[PDB]
From a paper:
Here we present cryo-EM data showing [name] F1Fo ATP synthase in different rotational and inhibited sub-states, observed following incubation with 10 mM [name]. Masked 3D classification focusing on the central rotor highlighted sub-states in which the εCTD adopted either a condensed down conformation or an extended half-up conformation. The maps generated for each of these sub-states showed the position of the εCTD, with local resolution estimates of 4–5 Å. However, due to the likely high flexibility of this sample, it was still difficult to unequivocally assign the position of the membrane domain subunits (a, b, and c subunits) in the maps. To obtain clearer information in this region, a refinement that focused on the Fo motor was performed and produced maps of sufficient detail to enable fitting of the membrane region. In the half up sub-states, no density for εCTH2 was observed, however εCTH1 remained attached to subunit γ. When the εCTD is half-up, εCTH1 provides an additional link between the εNTD and subunit γ, stabilizing the conformation of the central stalk together.
A key component in the generation of cellular energy is the F1Fo ATP synthase, a biological rotary motor that converts proton motive force (pmf) to adenosine tri-phosphate (ATP) in both oxidative phosphorylation and photophosphorylation. The enzyme is based on two rotary motors, termed F1 and Fo, that are coupled together by two stalks: a central rotor stalk and a peripheral stator stalk. [name] and other related bacteria exploit an internal subunit, termed ε, that can sense the environment and inhibit the enzyme under certain conditions.
Residue numbers in the entry:
A (entry chain a): 4 to 269
B (entry chain J), C (entry chain M), E (entry chain L), F (entry chain S), G (entry chain Q), H (entry chain N), ...: 3 to 79
D (entry chain R): 3 to 78
L (entry chain H): 3 to 103
M (entry chain X), N (entry chain Y): 1 to 52
Amino acid sequence: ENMTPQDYIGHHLNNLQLDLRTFSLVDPQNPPATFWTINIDSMFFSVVLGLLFLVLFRSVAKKATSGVPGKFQTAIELVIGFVNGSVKDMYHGKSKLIAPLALTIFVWVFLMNLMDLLPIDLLPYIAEHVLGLPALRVVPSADVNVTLSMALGVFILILFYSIKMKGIGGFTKELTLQPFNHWAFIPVNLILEGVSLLSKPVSLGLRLFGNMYAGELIFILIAGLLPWWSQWILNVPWAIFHILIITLQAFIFMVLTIVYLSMASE
Amino acid sequence: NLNMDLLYMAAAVMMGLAAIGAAIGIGILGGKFLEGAARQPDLIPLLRTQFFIVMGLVDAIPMIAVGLGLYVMFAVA
Amino acid sequence: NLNMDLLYMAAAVMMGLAAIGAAIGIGILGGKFLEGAARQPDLIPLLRTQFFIVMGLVDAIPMIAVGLGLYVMFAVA
Amino acid sequence: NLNMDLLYMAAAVMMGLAAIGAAIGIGILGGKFLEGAARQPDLIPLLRTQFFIVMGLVDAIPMIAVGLGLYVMFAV
Amino acid sequence: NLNMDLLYMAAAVMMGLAAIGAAIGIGILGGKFLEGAARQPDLIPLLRTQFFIVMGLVDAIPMIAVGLGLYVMFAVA
Amino acid sequence: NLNMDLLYMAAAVMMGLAAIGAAIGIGILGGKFLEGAARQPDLIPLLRTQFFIVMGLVDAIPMIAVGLGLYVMFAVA
Amino acid sequence: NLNMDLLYMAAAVMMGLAAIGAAIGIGILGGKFLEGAARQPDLIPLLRTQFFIVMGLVDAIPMIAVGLGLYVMFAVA
Amino acid sequence: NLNMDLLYMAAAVMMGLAAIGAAIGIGILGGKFLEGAARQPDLIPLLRTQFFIVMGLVDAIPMIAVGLGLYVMFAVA
Amino acid sequence: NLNMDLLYMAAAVMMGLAAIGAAIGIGILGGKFLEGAARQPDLIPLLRTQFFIVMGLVDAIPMIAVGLGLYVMFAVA
Amino acid sequence: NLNMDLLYMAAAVMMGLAAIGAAIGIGILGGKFLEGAARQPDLIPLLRTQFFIVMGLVDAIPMIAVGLGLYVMFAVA
Amino acid sequence: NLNMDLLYMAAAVMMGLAAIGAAIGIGILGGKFLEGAARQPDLIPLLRTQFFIVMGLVDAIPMIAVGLGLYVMFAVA
Amino acid sequence: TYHLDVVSAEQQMFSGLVEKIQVTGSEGELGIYPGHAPLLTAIKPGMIRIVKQHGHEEFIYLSGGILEVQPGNVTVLADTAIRGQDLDEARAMEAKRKAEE
Amino acid sequence: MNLNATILGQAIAFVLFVLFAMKYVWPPLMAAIEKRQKEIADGLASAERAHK
Amino acid sequence: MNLNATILGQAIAFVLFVLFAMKYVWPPLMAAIEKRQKEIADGLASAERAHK
């Protein structure tokens, strides 16, 4: 067993990347710089968690009744309550898509984060020492590319909804006149307001990414730099606090999505 | 060599100043939210909604700083 | 060489000061918003519009700073 | 060589401190604008005129500092 | 190998600015909590709930800074 | 070459600190005029007269600093 | 010579910023405690039990800073 | 050569800190003058008198600083 | 020779930062003490006891900072 | 020899910081003086005496700093 | 060079940060002295004796720094 | 414009719709412009300035009282004589002394 | 750490899960809740009509 | 290094963490039962009494 503590830590920081052109696995010992290598672990957990959310909720929704209320049915109606309560006041237009957009983002992001509570060495053990895989980590949201995918989708939606609900004719006026409104300032005005527009999705993505990266880092540091008796004593309060972090961060991501779009369209 | 010594320091300055900015900003904003919660009870959910709206705007520039500090630390150095 | 080691430092200092400036500015501005929403529930939709009208000018210069920081870091490099 | 990156540093200092100045000054100014707007609700169009009068003075120096940061950065 | 000695300095600046940010942020937040308790002492277990919620937002960035600085000081150096 | 590359820093310090000084000084000073204008609008012209007299005193020294910053940068080079 | 020198300098910056953090944070928090004591004095045994709860949070981060300061001075030497 | 060059930096710091001192100090003092004018408009010629009495003490030290900054920049240079 | 000659600077940073922290913390805390003593003057010997209770917690970190500074000057250097 | 340039820098730091302290402390104190003189304008001769009693203490340490700055520049350098 | 000039710089940092601390702490404390003296103009002897009780503690920890800065300048350097 | 009533316990001094007024509040003079925010304070003895709707400016002396404001409606509850703890104590002692007799 | 083509697959997953909730999870659950609440409305209204 | 100690530490941590969850985070599901009984069950019962 070749694991020195600092070298041991490195293997957590390394992902399970594929190669698009040969379908080969990129090994941790030598990670060349290349964008065309999908992180199998991140995508696998992302899609699996989305599928489990869909399976459970669609299974009971497909069977739902208005009779005697059930145990799991109550949980469904309660999270529908929190989501619909947010949507019900922050949004005012007709659009159908806003509500399921918020719902799926909330639950799916929370599920990505929820994996972080799972013990750090265990499932990578079943990755390496069972199925023969060179590396693993189990929190997709701690990887950049899922968060930027969602955030830049929200960017597409900002453009799309804003142009749909006020047109280019007024969109140009807003993006050029503000904030000083006087015609000599227009060229300088657009420079400021454009990066203002792009800062919204970028901040969404980086905000979520930073929090989850740091959480898994706490587990990595606990496992790598500390002895058993201190591992448990420091890990317990950490996990308890991380519960609050992941709950509020998921809710924040959803709320801010709704709010950005509302600011553009309404 | 000479690279990592300064690249860690760059990241450190970045995320330290970001920590100041975010912590103090949400400190002032949250203190006003809590005097509002003490003053008029049972408007806690509505003021909580406004608090999250404003909080998202406070965290914007600091989270850009945080993300780029993480980039500098674990990508460039 | 030395150029990149100082340029990451330069972008760092500029975006760090931008972060503090913007975050504390909106922190104060939002604090007055929440206190003004506290006493009377009537005009939340009104103050929350004056809030964006002013918050635009708060973020005027810090996004010049952030734009030039990103410019240095990814294009002057 | 050593010349240019120190010029970029000097521009960073000038324009970052301009960011602090122009941000905090209008934080302090606009907060009093909002509480005044929240007290006498008919007067917002009047008080907003006063707000731009004084906003012209607050930004006065930070725009010299930003022009000099841009000048050191690009022109010199 | 001079590389080590700057990394302790770089860790020092992160944890120093993180300590300032978090300490004063929770100072301002908790002071408004205590005046809220001074007015409405039958609400303290409710106001404490709201306080925990706001604190969970205040502490994020400084905890990232401290985590990274501890990492620099021990794993990298 | 070696001589001039530090005079830009001598300029930078003067105008950064003078910018902060002038900006926040006038920020405080104007905030009080708006507060006083909230109680008696008919005293808004009267108070407006006080504002400019005092503002002349507030930004006297910062303009000595801004002037010698421009002197250094464009006459000593 | 100058390796062991700069370790002590690093501990200086670490514990100095920690000192500001703890001192100011408890200054604000304890000031609000005393105003709560002044307004309803027979209520002090309750507010003091909330003060020692929040006060623990405030110094928690400045005390791991201090712990690493003494580590850097005495243990690393 | 540094005996010419550093003296502009040494004057920069003097006339930056003098500017922050004078500007913030007169900002606070003049703001209190303005609110006192708002409550008691009959007393403006009195409060104006005491304002100019008190304001000559705030400037006592910043003008030592600015005079020596001018001296260092031009006399010793 | 530079090794101990910089240790005097290390102690300067450490105990100067401790001085500003302790002085401002005790200043805020004592300000609430005196306003308490003006609202309930028949109460001063109680609140002064509480002031001495919490002033022991404010200084606990600055006093060890000052002690380590004096140690660095007289023992080490 | 080059040493004489650092003595101007040392006096610059010392005297500029004393200017910050002596300006802002009297700013805060005199602002409360005016706020009290607006309230009770028949007590200007009494408050104006207490103001000099306490103002004597505010600027004592700054006066030591300014005297030593002048000593360093003119006598030593 | 390196022996004497850094000792003057260390004294500058000690006796400048002591100026900031000992001036602003007494500004904050004396402002509350002058507010109480406006609410209770019969209590001024009692509040000024409380003010000296508190002021001794505010100044005590900066005076270590001022005396020790004088030590560093004259006895060491 | 807003509906103002100036009233006392014995008689109603004035009423009607008004554009603005200036009143000596406990902390200082204050102008109540149309549709003003809610308010409650004690008011000092002296003249107060009315400008009734259509601009008819007027002076009313009041011996003191309480002022209150809300968006549609505003009122002043005026005292008839100068109220002070010393004067009230004089009246109370006059009652006691008469009671012994 | 490293930018990656993983960003595209996540977009595919995003639109898929949105579509599966849009046409098959939200509409059924909206009707169920509304049916439960319709019982409330109908009941209290019935009592009040009798009262008239 | 011996990695068994890390597994043991993580097992102990997970055990204590789950105890905290069971004793402090499980009871909030009782508030869900209250939301069942009062809104749905008693509301429909009241509606049925109103019909009758």
